[PDB]
Amino acid sequence: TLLNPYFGEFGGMYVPQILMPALNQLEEAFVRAQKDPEFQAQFADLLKNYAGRPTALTKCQNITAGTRTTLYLKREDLLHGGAHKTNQVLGQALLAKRMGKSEIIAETGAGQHGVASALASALLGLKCRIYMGAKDVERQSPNVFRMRLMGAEVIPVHSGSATLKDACNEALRDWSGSYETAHYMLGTAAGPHPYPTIVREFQRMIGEETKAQILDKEGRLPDAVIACVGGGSNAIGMFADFINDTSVGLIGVEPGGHGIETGEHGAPLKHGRVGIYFGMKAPMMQTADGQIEESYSISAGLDFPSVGPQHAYLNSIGRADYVSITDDEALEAFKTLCRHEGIIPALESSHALAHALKMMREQPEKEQLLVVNLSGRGDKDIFTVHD
Amino acid sequence: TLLNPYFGEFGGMYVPQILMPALNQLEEAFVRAQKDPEFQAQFADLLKNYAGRPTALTKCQNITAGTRTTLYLKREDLLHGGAHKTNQVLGQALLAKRMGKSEIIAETGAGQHGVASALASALLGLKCRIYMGAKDVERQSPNVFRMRLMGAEVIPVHSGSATLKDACNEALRDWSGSYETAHYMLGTAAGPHPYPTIVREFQRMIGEETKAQILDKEGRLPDAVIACVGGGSNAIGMFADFINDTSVGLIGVEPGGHGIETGEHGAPLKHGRVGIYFGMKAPMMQTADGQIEESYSISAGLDFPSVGPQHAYLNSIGRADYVSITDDEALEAFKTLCRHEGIIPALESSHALAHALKMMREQPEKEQLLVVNLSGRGDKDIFTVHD
Amino acid sequence: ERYENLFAQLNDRREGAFVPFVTLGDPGIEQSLKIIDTLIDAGADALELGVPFSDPLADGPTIQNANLRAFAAGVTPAQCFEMLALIREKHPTIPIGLLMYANLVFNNGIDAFYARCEQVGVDSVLVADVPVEESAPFRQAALRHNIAPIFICPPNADDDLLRQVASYGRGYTYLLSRSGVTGAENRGPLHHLIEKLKEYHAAPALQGFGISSPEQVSAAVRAGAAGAISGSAIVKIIEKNLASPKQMLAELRSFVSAMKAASR
Amino acid sequence: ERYENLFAQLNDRREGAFVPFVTLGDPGIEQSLKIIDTLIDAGADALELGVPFSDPLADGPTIQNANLRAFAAGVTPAQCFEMLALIREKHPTIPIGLLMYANLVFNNGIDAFYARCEQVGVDSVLVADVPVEESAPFRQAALRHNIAPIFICPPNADDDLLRQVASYGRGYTYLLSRSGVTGAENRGPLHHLIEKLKEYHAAPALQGFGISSPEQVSAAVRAGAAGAISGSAIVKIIEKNLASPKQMLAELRSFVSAMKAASR
Ligand SMILES: O=P(O)(O)/C=C/CCSc1ccccc1O
Ligand SMILES: O=P(O)(O)/C=C/CCSc1ccccc1O
Ligand SMILES: *Cc1c(COP(=O)(O)O)cnc(C)c1O
Ligand SMILES: *Cc1c(COP(=O)(O)O)cnc(C)c1O
Ligand code: NA
Ligand code: NA
């Protein structure tokens, strides 16, 4: 390969031999595209005029009242589609096109990655095929209709636990015999190389924009940047540009579900076990037998059974810290932002906000310049929180 | 008054004597605010960093394929809240504050103006009271919960037809005895002066941004700008900056429901009759007895029983043209944008897009530079179109 | 000159005016005609009659329901004028004032509306949603057809407003005792406005809004007002007795008689 | 040197190898042990045995359902090794190859996995989701415990891949006859790879994927391959007869015997 498939001990390229040429092709088209000004200008154009780039950085004043904390929010909820996922897919769709490919395959859980993949493919004339665990298709009706309305083929996966895990499997199965005309649009900064590197590089805007923005608004880098971690995309997109700024703390927030102690969570990086699956060596929701398990969270989008290799690596060397947040904790952060700031946050993002609120509430006299990545919109979650 | 309450024959200030001092106060605080750089800089700040201003202008390439038409879309669907309504409320909330007021009263039909009023009030520490016709409260559950979640008091109006008409009544009734501490945040460019003038001036960004944007992208003003007209806000916001550019055509699109011929529509400006109601002299959905009637449309947001006075005036002198679009026509435009462009448009906006599609499809060899105001997002309408 | 003679007569008697209000056709054309005759027979000096409107935005719950009840019986404006023609043929001297919303007078042409009022015998017209700033056409048409254009003098009225109301108005000056909408629910110091209106030779003031007890009408008169208008207290009796028309009338008489007595 | 002797024996007979595949514990531990003995008794030259995995991403519907059926019976990896120990105690010479997914060998430590294989009598291990680029630890541990590390030679294989597979691999070279996943559903010209692998002294090629008819195994042998592996065609028979275990066995024998004959 041209780039290192690993981040320390994590990553790799654990896919059947048949798919290796596809990963080598993809890697090389990415490196070329990255050095191609025509590609860069094309991606930048789609990002600006079609998606809404750059996104705002909102100073939440009311919320931090009575404390010495200053909190900003990366407004990824204002991107087209309602989530940061839109950045990633646009670039990957252009990559598929650069490769001479005209078919897209996509895995999805809460349906947010599928909607994103579907809109990108519609816009760029790609044939989109999307796999969704049957249990998620029954659970995520509005996203399924949105996907179908945008031309995408939605295909229910009934194998295994009929959820994300199984949808991912099906996509790689499909890809193992269709790679020659179709590209696999992976949904997060995980999976086999070059994917974790590509999704990151295609999510970098977030942290790159947050830097210039905070430097303009406060003339200083933040004390810390916080982001939820389901798979790792929105978090690494934020973290990326701040990694070499050692004074800025990086905080990844994993879903705690009903509590770590109950085993009903989605915190593999911190409470999981290293294993090899989905073309990756990384922390995982696993049984004692090494059978792959499911990730639980009140938020559907934070249910990827593992985490990105770079995160597991940033945690290993101490560059970044990973904590968790329960369902109730996320519910409260969600409630509070609605009421004091007039912003309905995705329940995914709410976990990140919940940690920032903790940092504040716990040390109210501590001077802190905080930025939380509001990866998505919460209009989605109105019913769920309501019940 | 300081400004002319009328636009030709339309407008006026038809409210009980008790409310006249409130309209005079409001008018004067608006004129002052307009000349106040501190206000302007504050409104501009909220607009940029909290709402997402400026919005994109998206060239729809696929959709116009096979024709000599170039179509752009004002991306008001990417504003915070999902609709252009957010611009208006922020300024009016600052106006209420300038006035020493700390209470907000708001009328709403589809619930979009209520959500907007609610988020603005939450953000600026105003106490928000919202009236909604009972039939709309039963019909618009997600918006009601959103409103309530953002701190607003939602109050069902059971009088009359228990819809918009009646909600508007209740708000003016309330205001007639609370004006001293509360401001009435009217939802569109209609009602008694100074409201049509204020909502316009606070919606001007749209057309002002579209000008610089198209001038940059095409080096020419558009041949025409198209926008849906329920009450008139999004349309006048677009039109405003182009009024003195006589070469640019202005196209207002009214809902046709099942067909004008069936009487089941919401096209008063063109198929209604001039009357006096809601503090206004303007075209209206009326019976032969002058009893106020309801406006019908597949889209809930285009059900304001009348239209703005300036529109009725721009139509009168020939400055702007108003046409209508049926339910099916809007359904088709909605479908087409989803499939070819990856954008789910509000069913309100779809009426505007539907007319642009007509102009194209009907004269495919005609060279046309068109801009459609995509006033809002269509995630709202997924279920409705689905059924 | 119905109001003119009524006020001169009441002045000689050192008496105030009691003016009840009802929606025409509430709860039915026939019961309403019967309600109106009972109103007069119990001592009403004048009448304030509203024609059913779809959006009575200056009225509280009681009068709102009065319009709903009328609507349910199918009372149209055409029917109201027919009712008014008959009420006049029955009572030659009593001042008849109409409570109107703007669309209803503008609908068939403002001029044609005031001509119909004349033809029928209406004495005045108060258009609830037209301030003095917008009264010109209505004022002009009223005068042209010998109809007294009624203006509302609010508690927050400035001097220019007082001076306008006093020059334009005829019949009587509608003096609000409160902010808000109609309703006997919220009870309403009007001495200054009363003296100033007198100074400008305005029409005799008639206090309206909240007047529900005989005590209230005696105080209006004591403060210098020429009389008082009561609507919701009146309409509430109709609401209270929809299942017993005879009791409605009986109760209507009792309240109006007790109310009229309070002005003497 | 189980594969070594088997291939030398088959070469002297100018015969190809027939290697059926099944998931251990499908549809039950006992029926599976019975299925495996029937497989051997009907003429299987070797065995490819998969241990139940939650996410078999290189397998089509048939084998997917094979893992589901095993899971439904509660077959754990520990149970599989117990089954394998017994199969070996029953059959001393037959080559036993395991079809494995990566997490299952890495779970309790890669080294500890290959030691267990030795202890039990396993002859080889194919880790379905580890390309040659990532085989190092698995390859090394296999050799350390006298286990033949099996590599997959795909149809799109370049020369460097062919040269890698030939130097690292032991036992047999898994030659894919198709792209895609396992399934008798899609039928798979492999002459070039076969000759090149021979040139590099690779392990005898065993064609796998799509092999469902005796005609297919005779052709593999004719093309120069040392034998063929068949899984889905085999497992489909188990699926077909879940309600009749006796017929399952009877049908298993019939197909395997007809398949073995095609290599002779
Ligand atoms: O119910 P009240 O006694 O508070 C008042 C009754 C007066 C009815 S006349 C009237 C006057 C002004 C605006 C609306 C009206 O309906
Ligand atoms: O069902 P087939 O006859 O197409 C193939 C069977 C071989 C099973 S062994 C095997 C080999 C590679 C990857 C996954 C597997 O399960
Ligand atoms: C898609 C999704 C996620 C899960 O995110 P990764 O960034 O891939 O961890 C998080 N937040 C939102 C809003 C999402 O829609
Ligand atoms: C609120 C609403 C409207 C109705 O609009 P006016 O601009 O006031 O006519 C139109 N479009 C959308 C998306 C809306 O939400
Ligand atoms: Na995870
Ligand atoms: Na309208």
PDB file of N, CA and C in Angstrom, chain C residues 202-245:
ATOM      1  N   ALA C 202     -68.498  66.491  22.072  1.00  0.00           N
ATOM      2  CA  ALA C 202     -68.600  65.137  21.534  1.00  0.00           C
ATOM      3  C   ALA C 202     -70.027  64.628  21.724  1.00  0.00           C
ATOM      4  N   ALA C 203     -70.291  63.427  21.229  1.00  0.00           N
ATOM      5  CA  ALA C 203     -71.609  62.828  21.379  1.00  0.00           C
ATOM      6  C   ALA C 203     -71.657  62.293  22.812  1.00  0.00           C
ATOM      7  N   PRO C 204     -72.857  62.239  23.429  1.00  0.00           N
ATOM      8  CA  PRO C 204     -72.968  61.735  24.802  1.00  0.00           C
ATOM      9  C   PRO C 204     -72.257  60.382  24.931  1.00  0.00           C
ATOM     10  N   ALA C 205     -71.362  60.279  25.906  1.00  0.00           N
ATOM     11  CA  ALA C 205     -70.610  59.052  26.108  1.00  0.00           C
ATOM     12  C   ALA C 205     -71.468  57.903  26.604  1.00  0.00           C
ATOM     13  N   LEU C 206     -71.192  56.712  26.084  1.00  0.00           N
ATOM     14  CA  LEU C 206     -71.876  55.507  26.503  1.00  0.00           C
ATOM     15  C   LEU C 206     -70.742  54.558  26.862  1.00  0.00           C
ATOM     16  N   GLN C 207     -70.615  54.242  28.154  1.00  0.00           N
ATOM     17  CA  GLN C 207     -69.585  53.311  28.633  1.00  0.00           C
ATOM     18  C   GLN C 207     -69.873  51.856  28.256  1.00  0.00           C
ATOM     19  N   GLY C 208     -68.878  51.181  27.680  1.00  0.00           N
ATOM     20  CA  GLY C 208     -69.055  49.797  27.273  1.00  0.00           C
ATOM     21  C   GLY C 208     -67.851  48.943  27.590  1.00  0.00           C
ATOM     22  N   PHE C 209     -68.102  47.650  27.802  1.00  0.00           N
ATOM     23  CA  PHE C 209     -67.112  46.626  28.172  1.00  0.00           C
ATOM     24  C   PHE C 209     -67.121  46.369  29.682  1.00  0.00           C
ATOM     25  N   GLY C 210     -67.465  45.142  30.066  1.00  0.00           N
ATOM     26  CA  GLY C 210     -67.471  44.750  31.465  1.00  0.00           C
ATOM     27  C   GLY C 210     -68.690  45.074  32.306  1.00  0.00           C
ATOM     28  N   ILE C 211     -69.579  45.929  31.791  1.00  0.00           N
ATOM     29  CA  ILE C 211     -70.782  46.341  32.519  1.00  0.00           C
ATOM     30  C   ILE C 211     -71.732  45.170  32.712  1.00  0.00           C
ATOM     31  N   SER C 212     -71.778  44.656  33.937  1.00  0.00           N
ATOM     32  CA  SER C 212     -72.631  43.515  34.251  1.00  0.00           C
ATOM     33  C   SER C 212     -73.563  43.666  35.461  1.00  0.00           C
ATOM     34  N   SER C 213     -73.322  44.676  36.296  1.00  0.00           N
ATOM     35  CA  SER C 213     -74.147  44.901  37.494  1.00  0.00           C
ATOM     36  C   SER C 213     -74.752  46.312  37.544  1.00  0.00           C
ATOM     37  N   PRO C 214     -75.963  46.446  38.118  1.00  0.00           N
ATOM     38  CA  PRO C 214     -76.668  47.733  38.239  1.00  0.00           C
ATOM     39  C   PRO C 214     -75.808  48.803  38.896  1.00  0.00           C
ATOM     40  N   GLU C 215     -74.915  48.348  39.770  1.00  0.00           N
ATOM     41  CA  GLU C 215     -73.982  49.212  40.479  1.00  0.00           C
ATOM     42  C   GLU C 215     -73.077  49.914  39.490  1.00  0.00           C
ATOM     43  N   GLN C 216     -72.684  49.164  38.468  1.00  0.00           N
ATOM     44  CA  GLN C 216     -71.789  49.655  37.438  1.00  0.00           C
ATOM     45  C   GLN C 216     -72.445  50.763  36.594  1.00  0.00           C
ATOM     46  N   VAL C 217     -73.715  50.594  36.221  1.00  0.00           N
ATOM     47  CA  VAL C 217     -74.396  51.634  35.435  1.00  0.00           C
ATOM     48  C   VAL C 217     -74.663  52.923  36.254  1.00  0.00           C
ATOM     49  N   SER C 218     -74.893  52.784  37.565  1.00  0.00           N
ATOM     50  CA  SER C 218     -75.128  53.964  38.414  1.00  0.00           C
ATOM     51  C   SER C 218     -73.841  54.754  38.533  1.00  0.00           C
ATOM     52  N   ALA C 219     -72.721  54.041  38.599  1.00  0.00           N
ATOM     53  CA  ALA C 219     -71.415  54.688  38.697  1.00  0.00           C
ATOM     54  C   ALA C 219     -71.026  55.382  37.385  1.00  0.00           C
ATOM     55  N   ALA C 220     -71.352  54.775  36.245  1.00  0.00           N
ATOM     56  CA  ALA C 220     -71.036  55.377  34.941  1.00  0.00           C
ATOM     57  C   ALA C 220     -71.722  56.737  34.862  1.00  0.00           C
ATOM     58  N   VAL C 221     -72.998  56.735  35.228  1.00  0.00           N
ATOM     59  CA  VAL C 221     -73.823  57.936  35.222  1.00  0.00           C
ATOM     60  C   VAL C 221     -73.282  58.969  36.205  1.00  0.00           C
ATOM     61  N   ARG C 222     -72.850  58.509  37.382  1.00  0.00           N
ATOM     62  CA  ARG C 222     -72.289  59.378  38.428  1.00  0.00           C
ATOM     63  C   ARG C 222     -70.998  60.045  38.010  1.00  0.00           C
ATOM     64  N   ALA C 223     -70.229  59.351  37.169  1.00  0.00           N
ATOM     65  CA  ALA C 223     -68.945  59.851  36.666  1.00  0.00           C
ATOM     66  C   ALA C 223     -69.118  60.879  35.549  1.00  0.00           C
ATOM     67  N   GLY C 224     -70.347  61.020  35.064  1.00  0.00           N
ATOM     68  CA  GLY C 224     -70.622  61.972  33.999  1.00  0.00           C
ATOM     69  C   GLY C 224     -70.993  61.361  32.654  1.00  0.00           C
ATOM     70  N   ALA C 225     -70.952  60.032  32.546  1.00  0.00           N
ATOM     71  CA  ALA C 225     -71.297  59.359  31.300  1.00  0.00           C
ATOM     72  C   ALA C 225     -72.800  59.403  31.115  1.00  0.00           C
ATOM     73  N   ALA C 226     -73.242  59.471  29.866  1.00  0.00           N
ATOM     74  CA  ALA C 226     -74.678  59.533  29.561  1.00  0.00           C
ATOM     75  C   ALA C 226     -75.414  58.202  29.701  1.00  0.00           C
ATOM     76  N   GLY C 227     -74.672  57.112  29.833  1.00  0.00           N
ATOM     77  CA  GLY C 227     -75.300  55.813  29.970  1.00  0.00           C
ATOM     78  C   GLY C 227     -74.281  54.704  29.835  1.00  0.00           C
ATOM     79  N   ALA C 228     -74.773  53.471  29.812  1.00  0.00           N
ATOM     80  CA  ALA C 228     -73.908  52.315  29.705  1.00  0.00           C
ATOM     81  C   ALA C 228     -74.499  51.239  28.811  1.00  0.00           C
ATOM     82  N   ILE C 229     -73.608  50.533  28.112  1.00  0.00           N
ATOM     83  CA  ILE C 229     -73.956  49.430  27.227  1.00  0.00           C
ATOM     84  C   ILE C 229     -73.514  48.129  27.916  1.00  0.00           C
ATOM     85  N   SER C 230     -74.362  47.102  27.877  1.00  0.00           N
ATOM     86  CA  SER C 230     -74.052  45.794  28.473  1.00  0.00           C
ATOM     87  C   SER C 230     -74.356  44.699  27.463  1.00  0.00           C
ATOM     88  N   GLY C 231     -73.367  43.865  27.151  1.00  0.00           N
ATOM     89  CA  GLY C 231     -73.589  42.802  26.184  1.00  0.00           C
ATOM     90  C   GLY C 231     -73.442  41.382  26.682  1.00  0.00           C
ATOM     91  N   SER C 232     -72.252  41.028  27.137  1.00  0.00           N
ATOM     92  CA  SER C 232     -71.994  39.685  27.626  1.00  0.00           C
ATOM     93  C   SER C 232     -72.880  39.248  28.790  1.00  0.00           C
ATOM     94  N   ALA C 233     -73.201  40.168  29.702  1.00  0.00           N
ATOM     95  CA  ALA C 233     -74.049  39.840  30.846  1.00  0.00           C
ATOM     96  C   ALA C 233     -75.407  39.464  30.307  1.00  0.00           C
ATOM     97  N   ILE C 234     -75.805  40.157  29.251  1.00  0.00           N
ATOM     98  CA  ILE C 234     -77.067  39.939  28.580  1.00  0.00           C
ATOM     99  C   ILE C 234     -77.074  38.606  27.850  1.00  0.00           C
ATOM    100  N   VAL C 235     -76.079  38.406  26.984  1.00  0.00           N
ATOM    101  CA  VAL C 235     -75.930  37.190  26.174  1.00  0.00           C
ATOM    102  C   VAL C 235     -75.715  35.928  27.018  1.00  0.00           C
ATOM    103  N   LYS C 236     -75.107  36.099  28.187  1.00  0.00           N
ATOM    104  CA  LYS C 236     -74.862  34.981  29.086  1.00  0.00           C
ATOM    105  C   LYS C 236     -76.193  34.405  29.540  1.00  0.00           C
ATOM    106  N   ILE C 237     -77.202  35.269  29.679  1.00  0.00           N
ATOM    107  CA  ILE C 237     -78.537  34.826  30.087  1.00  0.00           C
ATOM    108  C   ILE C 237     -79.160  33.971  28.979  1.00  0.00           C
ATOM    109  N   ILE C 238     -78.917  34.353  27.726  1.00  0.00           N
ATOM    110  CA  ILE C 238     -79.422  33.599  26.584  1.00  0.00           C
ATOM    111  C   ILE C 238     -78.760  32.211  26.565  1.00  0.00           C
ATOM    112  N   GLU C 239     -77.452  32.183  26.802  1.00  0.00           N
ATOM    113  CA  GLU C 239     -76.650  30.959  26.833  1.00  0.00           C
ATOM    114  C   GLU C 239     -77.127  30.022  27.937  1.00  0.00           C
ATOM    115  N   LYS C 240     -77.364  30.622  29.096  1.00  0.00           N
ATOM    116  CA  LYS C 240     -77.822  29.940  30.294  1.00  0.00           C
ATOM    117  C   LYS C 240     -79.164  29.261  30.111  1.00  0.00           C
ATOM    118  N   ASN C 241     -80.011  29.819  29.244  1.00  0.00           N
ATOM    119  CA  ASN C 241     -81.363  29.291  29.056  1.00  0.00           C
ATOM    120  C   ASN C 241     -81.782  28.819  27.664  1.00  0.00           C
ATOM    121  N   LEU C 242     -80.859  28.232  26.912  1.00  0.00           N
ATOM    122  CA  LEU C 242     -81.159  27.746  25.565  1.00  0.00           C
ATOM    123  C   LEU C 242     -82.212  26.638  25.513  1.00  0.00           C
ATOM    124  N   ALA C 243     -82.326  25.883  26.608  1.00  0.00           N
ATOM    125  CA  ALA C 243     -83.293  24.790  26.720  1.00  0.00           C
ATOM    126  C   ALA C 243     -84.625  25.256  27.306  1.00  0.00           C
ATOM    127  N   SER C 244     -84.690  26.516  27.729  1.00  0.00           N
ATOM    128  CA  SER C 244     -85.925  27.085  28.276  1.00  0.00           C
ATOM    129  C   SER C 244     -86.081  28.548  27.831  1.00  0.00           C
ATOM    130  N   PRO C 245     -86.646  28.752  26.624  1.00  0.00           N
ATOM    131  CA  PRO C 245     -86.896  30.055  25.996  1.00  0.00           C
ATOM    132  C   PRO C 245     -87.728  30.990  26.872  1.00  0.00           C
TER     133      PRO C 245
END
